[PDB]
Amino acid sequence: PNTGVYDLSGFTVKPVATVYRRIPNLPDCDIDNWLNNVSVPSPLNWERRI
Amino acid sequence: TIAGHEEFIQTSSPKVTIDCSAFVCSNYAACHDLLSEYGTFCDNINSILN
Ligand SMILES: *[C@@H]1O[C@H](CO)[C@@H](O[C@@H]2O[C@H](CO)[C@@H](O)[C@H](O)[C@H]2NC(C)=O)[C@H](O)[C@H]1NC(C)=O
Incomplete structure (x- = not known):
């Protein structure tokens, strides 16, 4: 080079x-434990946990 | 009498230099890998400023 x-x-x-x-x-x-809960909600009343 | 008045003439300006690949892709290696296949884009910017 230059x-x-x-x-x-x-x-x-x-x-x-x-x-x-x-x-x-x-x-x-x-x-x-929340995913393996016994009662499972329908799509009409889907459930949410925070 | 004798009057006096002053006048400014601009002859220069600040000399801005730019690192192109540090501006665009600062420190991240994936950014530099993507930028390397743009060819000669940063060299032209550095050459115009020089
Ligand atoms: C599965 O979900 C049910 C919700 O119906 C839980 O029942 C609640 O249990 C708590 C304490 O365990 C009670 O304070 C609530 O009052 C119950 N809910 C209702 C609507 O009665 C049940 O505990 C869950 N299973 C597990 C293993 O946690």
């Missing part, structure tokens, strides 16, 4: 570590 000033590839500072945070001691949702 003589000149070249603006080269963009660099980012690479991340050193990770900061992972959660909430400890939470209950279990138990969606499998």
Whole structure:
């Protein structure tokens, strides 16, 4: 190549570590117990759980 | 008497330079993989600004 000033590839500072945070001691949702419930609603009155 | 008045004439402007693939696809590798098959789009923008 010729003589000149070249603006080269963009660099980012690479991340050193990770900061992972959660909430400890939470209950279990138990969606499998609601799905395996005995009574099953019709499509006319479908059911919702939050 | 002798009057005096001032006048500004603009001879330059700020020299803006643009990193095209850092503007478009900042740090994400899938973006750079999709951008690499656009050919010579970023090189023309850098050449016009130079
Ligand atoms: C399956 O769903 C029924 C909903 O009809 C649940 O019955 C409710 O049970 C709770 C406590 O277990 C009672 O406080 C509610 O009053 C009941 N609902 C009605 C309409 O009476 C039943 O518990 C579910 N099964 C399981 C294993 O959780």
